[PDB]
Amino acid sequence: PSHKSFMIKKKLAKKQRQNRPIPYWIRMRTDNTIRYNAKRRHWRRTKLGF
């Protein structure tokens, strides 16, 4: 809600940063096996649980 604590807002900020595609140059490294971001989260599909 609009009324939120500082602690919760900080946690939500970190989750937004983590919810991005992997950089393209990561897949061109030597011996790379990372195909995509396996931890992508959508606000409507999976909830944060807090």
Binding site: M7, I8, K11, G49, F50
Partner: protein
């Protein structure tokens, strides 16, 4: 009404985030974490959950300080000295 209709009333949180363990397990009214028993001084651990023990035991985290003890032991915890300057 016990089924779908009852699930519509889910806007009061029993648990919040624990200050100590970070799980959404801090029972608000009991002021007690169901995961680590915070604010009790001793952590919550039970031998009847082998999996629970190994999820939270030493080494599952950062080992910020304990990771460097073996290195210092090999040198006999030497301190207050430095390698001789290169010639």
């Amino acid at each position: 009404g016990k089924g779908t209709g009852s699930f519509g009333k889910r806007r009061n949180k029993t648990h919040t985030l624990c200050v100590r363990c970070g799980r959404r397990s801090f029972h608000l009214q009991k002021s007690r974490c169901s995961a680590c028993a915070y604010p009790a001084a001793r952590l919550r651990s039970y031998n009847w959950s082998v999996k629970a023990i190994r999820r939270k035991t030493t080494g599952t985290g950062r080992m910020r300080y304990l990771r460097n003890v073996p290195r210092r032991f090999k040198t006999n915890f030497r301190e207050g000295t430095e390698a001789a300057p290169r010639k």
